[PDB]
Design a protein around this nucleic acid. Structure first.
Ligand SMILES: [Mg+2]
Ligand SMILES: [Mg+2]
Ligand SMILES: [Mg+2]
Ligand SMILES: [Mg+2]
Ligand SMILES: [Mg+2]
Ligand SMILES: [Mg+2]
Ligand SMILES: [Mg+2]
Length: 50
RNA sequence: UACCUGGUUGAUCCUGCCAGUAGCAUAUGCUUGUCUCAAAGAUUAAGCCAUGCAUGUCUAAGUACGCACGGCCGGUACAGUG
């Protein structure tokens, strides 16, 4: 499942301001940047060995 | 600038100190127009202290769900300022 679809967003409703909703930033979320960082670490290991 | 002068005797020559002489540091007195530097609660009490200040700090890059602002789109997990 996709955890991005179940984030509980709090409805922000202030007088005089356009009503809307807010969501937190998911932590410990596997993202392409995390995988790329892991790949780079492994690549550095390979370079050191070579 | 490698310097002396007054004072013991009726007078002399000595010894010898007292006093004078110049600088330098602290204080103090009288006086003081310009201008450049500039010391400054050490000495007595490392005695006692009202009050205020004297040490804080965020980048692109640890943690943002404060609408505190501001969205752009509005379910686009997380825009940005913070
Ligand atoms: Mg005699
Ligand atoms: Mg005489
Ligand atoms: Mg003398
Ligand atoms: Mg004199
Ligand atoms: Mg003047
Ligand atoms: Mg002092
Ligand atoms: Mg003192």
């Amino acid at each position: 499942d996709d955890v991005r679809q179940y984030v509980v967003r709090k409805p922000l409703n202030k007088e005089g301001k356009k009503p809307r909703t807010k969501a937190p930033k998911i932590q410990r979320l596997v993202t392409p940047r995390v995988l790329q960082h892991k790949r780079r670490r492994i690549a550095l290991k390979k370079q050191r060995t070579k």
